Enzyme design. Sequence first.
Site, PDB file in Angstrom:
ATOM      1  N   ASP A  70       0.793  -1.229   0.000  1.00 17.91           N
ATOM      2  CA  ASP A  70       0.000   0.000   0.000  1.00 17.91           C
ATOM      3  C   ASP A  70       0.824   1.278   0.000  1.00 17.91           C
ATOM      4  O   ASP A  70       0.338   2.348   0.379  1.00 17.91           O
ATOM      5  CB  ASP A  70      -0.986   0.019   1.171  1.00 17.91           C
ATOM      6  CG  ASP A  70      -0.312  -0.134   2.515  1.00 17.91           C
ATOM      7  OD1 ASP A  70       0.910   0.099   2.622  1.00 17.91           O
ATOM      8  OD2 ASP A  70      -1.026  -0.477   3.477  1.00 17.91           O
ATOM      9  N   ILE A  80       7.131   3.255  13.981  1.00 23.01           N
ATOM     10  CA  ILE A  80       5.738   3.123  13.533  1.00 23.01           C
ATOM     11  C   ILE A  80       5.214   1.766  13.983  1.00 23.01           C
ATOM     12  O   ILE A  80       5.784   0.750  13.645  1.00 23.01           O
ATOM     13  CB  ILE A  80       5.631   3.176  11.985  1.00 23.01           C
ATOM     14  CG1 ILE A  80       6.159   4.512  11.457  1.00 23.01           C
ATOM     15  CG2 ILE A  80       4.183   2.945  11.555  1.00 23.01           C
ATOM     16  CD1 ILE A  80       5.386   5.709  11.941  1.00 23.01           C
ATOM     17  N   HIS A  83      -0.938   1.247  11.277  1.00 22.48           N
ATOM     18  CA  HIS A  83      -1.654   2.330  10.624  1.00 22.48           C
ATOM     19  C   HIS A  83      -2.968   1.799  10.080  1.00 22.48           C
ATOM     20  O   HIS A  83      -3.134   0.590   9.894  1.00 22.48           O
ATOM     21  CB  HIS A  83      -0.809   3.001   9.525  1.00 22.48           C
ATOM     22  CG  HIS A  83      -0.429   2.101   8.391  1.00 22.48           C
ATOM     23  ND1 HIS A  83       0.746   2.262   7.686  1.00 22.48           N
ATOM     24  CD2 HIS A  83      -1.075   1.066   7.814  1.00 22.48           C
ATOM     25  CE1 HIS A  83       0.804   1.360   6.723  1.00 22.48           C
ATOM     26  NE2 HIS A  83      -0.289   0.623   6.778  1.00 22.48           N
ATOM     27  N   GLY A  92      -9.969   1.031   2.182  1.00 22.09           N
ATOM     28  CA  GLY A  92     -10.551   1.888   3.200  1.00 22.09           C
ATOM     29  C   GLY A  92     -10.938   1.150   4.467  1.00 22.09           C
ATOM     30  O   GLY A  92     -11.519   0.077   4.410  1.00 22.09           O
ATOM     31  N   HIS A  96      -3.419  -2.178   9.524  1.00 24.56           N
ATOM     32  CA  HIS A  96      -2.233  -3.011   9.411  1.00 24.56           C
ATOM     33  C   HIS A  96      -1.330  -2.788  10.616  1.00 24.56           C
ATOM     34  O   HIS A  96      -1.150  -1.662  11.079  1.00 24.56           O
ATOM     35  CB  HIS A  96      -1.472  -2.689   8.116  1.00 24.56           C
ATOM     36  CG  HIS A  96      -2.286  -2.868   6.871  1.00 24.56           C
ATOM     37  ND1 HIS A  96      -3.318  -3.775   6.776  1.00 24.56           N
ATOM     38  CD2 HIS A  96      -2.202  -2.270   5.658  1.00 24.56           C
ATOM     39  CE1 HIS A  96      -3.835  -3.727   5.562  1.00 24.56           C
ATOM     40  NE2 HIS A  96      -3.176  -2.822   4.864  1.00 24.56           N
ATOM     41  N   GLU A 101       7.126  -6.034  15.413  1.00 25.40           N
ATOM     42  CA  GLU A 101       7.016  -5.560  16.788  1.00 25.40           C
ATOM     43  C   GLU A 101       6.751  -6.700  17.752  1.00 25.40           C
ATOM     44  O   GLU A 101       6.241  -7.755  17.365  1.00 25.40           O
ATOM     45  CB  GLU A 101       5.868  -4.554  16.914  1.00 25.40           C
ATOM     46  CG  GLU A 101       5.968  -3.393  15.962  1.00 25.40           C
ATOM     47  CD  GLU A 101       7.034  -2.406  16.373  1.00 25.40           C
ATOM     48  OE1 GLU A 101       8.045  -2.826  16.971  1.00 25.40           O
ATOM     49  OE2 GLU A 101       6.860  -1.205  16.099  1.00 25.40           O
ATOM     50  N   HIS A 118      -6.600   2.342  19.030  1.00 24.95           N
ATOM     51  CA  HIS A 118      -6.215   3.608  18.424  1.00 24.95           C
ATOM     52  C   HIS A 118      -6.427   3.541  16.914  1.00 24.95           C
ATOM     53  O   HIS A 118      -7.077   4.402  16.331  1.00 24.95           O
ATOM     54  CB  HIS A 118      -4.745   3.901  18.724  1.00 24.95           C
ATOM     55  CG  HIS A 118      -4.230   5.160  18.098  1.00 24.95           C
ATOM     56  ND1 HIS A 118      -4.295   6.386  18.726  1.00 24.95           N
ATOM     57  CD2 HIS A 118      -3.624   5.379  16.909  1.00 24.95           C
ATOM     58  CE1 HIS A 118      -3.751   7.305  17.950  1.00 24.95           C
ATOM     59  NE2 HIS A 118      -3.335   6.720  16.841  1.00 24.95           N
ATOM     60  N   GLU A 119      -5.875   2.508  16.284  1.00 29.72           N
ATOM     61  CA  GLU A 119      -6.000   2.352  14.842  1.00 29.72           C
ATOM     62  C   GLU A 119      -7.451   2.301  14.371  1.00 29.72           C
ATOM     63  O   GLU A 119      -7.796   2.892  13.346  1.00 29.72           O
ATOM     64  CB  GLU A 119      -5.260   1.094  14.380  1.00 29.72           C
ATOM     65  CG  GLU A 119      -3.741   1.153  14.553  1.00 29.72           C
ATOM     66  CD  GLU A 119      -3.120   2.443  14.031  1.00 29.72           C
ATOM     67  OE1 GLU A 119      -3.557   2.946  12.974  1.00 29.72           O
ATOM     68  OE2 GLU A 119      -2.174   2.945  14.676  1.00 29.72           O
ATOM     69  N   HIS A 122      -9.057   5.424  13.610  1.00 31.10           N
ATOM     70  CA  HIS A 122      -8.773   5.861  12.255  1.00 31.10           C
ATOM     71  C   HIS A 122      -9.655   5.111  11.261  1.00 31.10           C
ATOM     72  O   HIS A 122     -10.170   5.706  10.324  1.00 31.10           O
ATOM     73  CB  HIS A 122      -7.303   5.631  11.912  1.00 31.10           C
ATOM     74  CG  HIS A 122      -6.366   6.530  12.655  1.00 31.10           C
ATOM     75  ND1 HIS A 122      -6.526   7.898  12.698  1.00 31.10           N
ATOM     76  CD2 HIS A 122      -5.239   6.259  13.352  1.00 31.10           C
ATOM     77  CE1 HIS A 122      -5.536   8.433  13.388  1.00 31.10           C
ATOM     78  NE2 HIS A 122      -4.740   7.461  13.796  1.00 31.10           N
ATOM     79  N   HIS A 128      -6.206  12.458  14.747  1.00 31.85           N
ATOM     80  CA  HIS A 128      -5.508  12.548  16.019  1.00 31.85           C
ATOM     81  C   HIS A 128      -6.115  13.667  16.842  1.00 31.85           C
ATOM     82  O   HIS A 128      -6.736  14.587  16.305  1.00 31.85           O
ATOM     83  CB  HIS A 128      -4.023  12.809  15.791  1.00 31.85           C
ATOM     84  CG  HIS A 128      -3.248  11.581  15.431  1.00 31.85           C
ATOM     85  ND1 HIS A 128      -1.999  11.630  14.853  1.00 31.85           N
ATOM     86  CD2 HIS A 128      -3.540  10.268  15.588  1.00 31.85           C
ATOM     87  CE1 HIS A 128      -1.553  10.402  14.670  1.00 31.85           C
ATOM     88  NE2 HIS A 128      -2.467   9.558  15.109  1.00 31.85           N
TER      89      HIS A 128
HETATM   90  N1  LIG Z   1       1.539   7.972  15.783  1.00 27.80           N
HETATM   91  C1  LIG Z   1       1.682   6.700  15.425  1.00 27.80           C
HETATM   92  C2  LIG Z   1       1.290   5.488  15.990  1.00 27.80           C
HETATM   93  N2  LIG Z   1       0.568   5.169  17.060  1.00 27.80           N
HETATM   94  C3  LIG Z   1      -0.298   3.983  16.963  1.00 27.80           C
HETATM   95  C4  LIG Z   1      -0.532   3.352  18.338  1.00 27.80           C
HETATM   96  C5  LIG Z   1      -0.992   4.429  19.321  1.00 27.80           C
HETATM   97  C6  LIG Z   1      -1.815   4.070  20.383  1.00 27.80           C
HETATM   98  C7  LIG Z   1      -2.247   5.025  21.297  1.00 27.80           C
HETATM   99  C8  LIG Z   1      -1.850   6.348  21.147  1.00 27.80           C
HETATM  100  C9  LIG Z   1      -2.289   7.437  22.127  1.00 27.80           C
HETATM  101  N3  LIG Z   1      -2.998   6.855  23.275  1.00 27.80           N
HETATM  102  C10 LIG Z   1      -2.378   6.166  24.229  1.00 27.80           C
HETATM  103  O1  LIG Z   1      -1.172   5.926  24.253  1.00 27.80           O
HETATM  104  C11 LIG Z   1      -3.316   5.665  25.328  1.00 27.80           C
HETATM  105  N4  LIG Z   1      -4.598   6.049  25.299  1.00 27.80           N
HETATM  106  C12 LIG Z   1      -5.461   5.645  26.238  1.00 27.80           C
HETATM  107  S1  LIG Z   1      -7.126   5.984  26.431  1.00 27.80           S
HETATM  108  C13 LIG Z   1      -7.365   5.069  27.857  1.00 27.80           C
HETATM  109  C14 LIG Z   1      -6.131   4.493  28.171  1.00 27.80           C
HETATM  110  C15 LIG Z   1      -5.090   4.810  27.291  1.00 27.80           C
HETATM  111  C16 LIG Z   1      -3.761   4.404  27.334  1.00 27.80           C
HETATM  112  O2  LIG Z   1      -3.358   3.658  28.226  1.00 27.80           O
HETATM  113  N5  LIG Z   1      -2.860   4.830  26.352  1.00 27.80           N
HETATM  114  C17 LIG Z   1      -5.874   3.512  29.320  1.00 27.80           C
HETATM  115  C18 LIG Z   1      -6.865   3.632  30.477  1.00 27.80           C
HETATM  116  S2  LIG Z   1      -8.575   3.570  29.836  1.00 27.80           S
HETATM  117  O3  LIG Z   1      -9.573   3.784  30.936  1.00 27.80           O
HETATM  118  O4  LIG Z   1      -8.831   2.262  29.148  1.00 27.80           O
HETATM  119  C19 LIG Z   1      -8.679   4.937  28.629  1.00 27.80           C
HETATM  120  C20 LIG Z   1      -1.029   6.706  20.086  1.00 27.80           C
HETATM  121  C21 LIG Z   1      -0.596   5.754  19.172  1.00 27.80           C
HETATM  122  C22 LIG Z   1       0.318   6.234  18.045  1.00 27.80           C
HETATM  123  C23 LIG Z   1       1.985   4.675  14.894  1.00 27.80           C
HETATM  124  O5  LIG Z   1       2.164   3.484  14.651  1.00 27.80           O
HETATM  125  C24 LIG Z   1       2.330   6.005  14.226  1.00 27.80           C
HETATM  126  O6  LIG Z   1       2.828   6.367  13.164  1.00 27.80           O
HETATM  127 CA   LIG Z   2       7.821  -0.508  13.513  1.00 28.14          CA
HETATM  128 CA   LIG Z   3     -11.806  -2.291   3.693  1.00 31.30          CA
HETATM  129 ZN   LIG Z   4      -0.366  -0.891   5.327  1.00 23.23          ZN
HETATM  130 ZN   LIG Z   5      -2.876   7.444  14.897  1.00 21.24          ZN
END
Ligand SMILES: Nc1c(N2CCc3ccc(CNC(=O)c4nc5sc6c(c5c(=O)[nH]4)CCS(=O)(=O)C6)cc3C2)c(=O)c1=O
Ligand SMILES: [Ca+2]
Ligand SMILES: [Ca+2]
Ligand SMILES: [Zn+2]
Ligand SMILES: [Zn+2]
Length: 163
Positions: A70, A80, A83, A92, A96, A101, A118-119, A122, A128
Amino acid sequence: MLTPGNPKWERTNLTYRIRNYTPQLSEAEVERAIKDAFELWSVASPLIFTRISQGEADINIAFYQRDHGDNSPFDGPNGILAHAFQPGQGIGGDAHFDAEETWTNTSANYNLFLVAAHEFGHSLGLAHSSDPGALMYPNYAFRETSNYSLPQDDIDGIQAIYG
Ligand SMILES: Nc1c(N2CCc3ccc(CNC(=O)c4nc5sc6c(c5c(=O)[nH]4)CCS(=O)(=O)C6)cc3C2)c(=O)c1=O
Ligand SMILES: [Ca+2]
Ligand SMILES: [Ca+2]
Ligand SMILES: [Zn+2]
Ligand SMILES: [Zn+2]
């Protein structure tokens, strides 16, 4: 329109398929992480996610390494983590995950559940968020807790799109 340029699904009942797995976790752990990640969003919207084992689901989920078709190649260990494509036909909505990791079900770097939740934001049309406590914040950081649910900012986000 609050989130110009970000598409949304026309239907609320979406199907998904886990195309392959990762040696880092058992198959059941991968499946449950995915199911729970979807549940975070479903309890705050009208979205209903249904899993299929073969064929074309709305949301393809897979683990791939580096170049994977892709034009958005992964980068090896760390960096990374994954995504996902915004709502739409074909690619769409697909999500992935970087197969190089160390995927876990703990606070150990790269908790699959958290990354997938998180993904999927999206996959559902969310961008974000600047709220450092939001699931959709740009930087991953596992914050262990008792009961896991969507921060209010993310609820505001999904509701703004689907009600
Ligand atoms: N940016 C990028 C990426 N990521 C994907 C994975 C990813 C996952 C999460 C975030 C931001 N959020 C956290 O790190 C996070 N959010 C939450 S919400 C929540 C929680 C959390 C948390 O622990 N971390 C835990 C307690 S809860 O009561 O269940 C409510 C950012 C990202 C950025 C890539 O890959 C990339 O490029
Ligand atoms: Ca990586
Ligand atoms: Ca699809
Ligand atoms: Zn991909
Ligand atoms: Zn993101």
